[model samples]
Target: PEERYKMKSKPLGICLIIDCIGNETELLRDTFTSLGYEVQKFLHLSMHGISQILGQFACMPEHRDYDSFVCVLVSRGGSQSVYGVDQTHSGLPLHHIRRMFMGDSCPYLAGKPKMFFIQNYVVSHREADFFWSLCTADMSLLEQSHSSPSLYLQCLSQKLRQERKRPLLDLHIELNGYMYDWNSRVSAKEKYYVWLQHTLRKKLILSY
Candidate 1:
């Protein structure tokens, strides 16, 4: 007699994309859904800002079902200053998002991929000399290169450590272990055990 050919079923995965009240969120949600993911969109409901939105999602039940997450945040200013919300009371969302995905209880997603994309205005003020020179330029030249003046200022600002800050769009990824738990065993019980172990390992590694 031949052995039976059994078909195995795995838990379905979910993809989440949180967008600010702007153009970037739409683009991100569309892109992820197009890539064959069951994408969920969480629009910031609070006037409080990005941090509050992130906190609300972190505790969502749907988030627990997903094996992986791709988080994209668009801040008009650096992480310190988000676009519409008041930065004085509302904290930065990006940091909190990272902390949640990288936490101990996220076994299914612990070793899974997390992607973050941030867009912001990094440059503050134009250099004094550059500004003065531009002020002295002919009307036609100044009008033609008005955009270039800002670009030049940004380039100069890069050389100064005090003026330069981290770009939030810089991608960050975290995995709890080298391999995914679902791929390890055939039995659901065994898979759960492996996942538990992986989660424990992640906590040890990250906490230390």
Candidate 2:
């Protein structure tokens, strides 16, 4: 593998935000830019659009130019999937999101930190105001917004800025605090997954 982060003063990364049926996208766009990331925004994108977007990155050799990668997805979701603007019941594929950056599709990003914040109603029905998060293997790197929630990126950015020295793991929990409660999955796997997620987050490093 090439020496990806060999350069000094880490280069600015790309902040890709896909605000589906959600709001406050610009606030987060500003947040990312404040952190020196070249921001890219896609509003009201469909599942196919999302796929095509990531595919472009996968096909590009320039992915290695950045210090890190951040993708914020604001959409409507269920247990393990998020919906596009198509208004479909099943929604988009969540695994594809992970696979793209994994050691496979985007192998150029290997060992580099990546952040994905998924802001949406996890509930299956839009009629109800309640929501939940997706069930996935690497829940540590993934932040799911379930139920009626606030503009996460802005609130989180504000809070993090005010408490600049706050431990990021603490800020992560605090962000979810403003969102809603979610602790029904009580299996051993779920418990361990929670612990593992906290560990991975400590290792990221972040932007705005």
Angstrom error of the Cα, residue 189, model 1: value is: 56
Question: Residue 65 of candidate 1: its Cα lDDT?
Answer: 56
Which candidate leads in TM-score? Answer: 2
Error of 1 at 180 (Å): 35
Q: Tell me the lDDT of model 2 at 182.
A: 32
Scored against the true structure, residue 186 in model 1 reaches a CA lDDT of: 39
Q: After superposition, how far is residue 134 of candidate 1 from its true place, in Å?
A: 31
Clashes of each: 3, 3
Model 2, residue 194: displacement in angstroms? 11
> Distance (Å) between predicted and true CA of 186, model 2?
24
